[PDB]
Amino acid sequence: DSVKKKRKKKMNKHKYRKLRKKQGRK
């Protein structure tokens, strides 16, 4: 798995961590 393919997972994980800290904090 190259860095270019790792970047797609990186962005999916960042957006999910953001959504989980915004939604599940409430």
Which CB, 6 or 17, lies closer to K ion? 6
Helix (H) or strand (E) holding 26: none
Alpha helices in the chain (DSSP H): 3-23
Q: Total number of residues binding RNA (CB under 7 A)?
A: 14
Instruction: Say whether residue 18 binds RNA (CB under 7 A).
Output: no
Instruction: Say whether residue 14 binds RNA (CB under 7 A).
Output: no
In the structure encoding, which two tokens stand for residue 24, read together? Answer: 């599940």
Which CB, 10 or 20, lies closer to K ion? 10
* Nearest CA-CA partner of 24 in 16, 12, 4: 16
Please give the residue ranges that form the binding site for K ion (CB under 5 A).
Answer: 6, 9-10
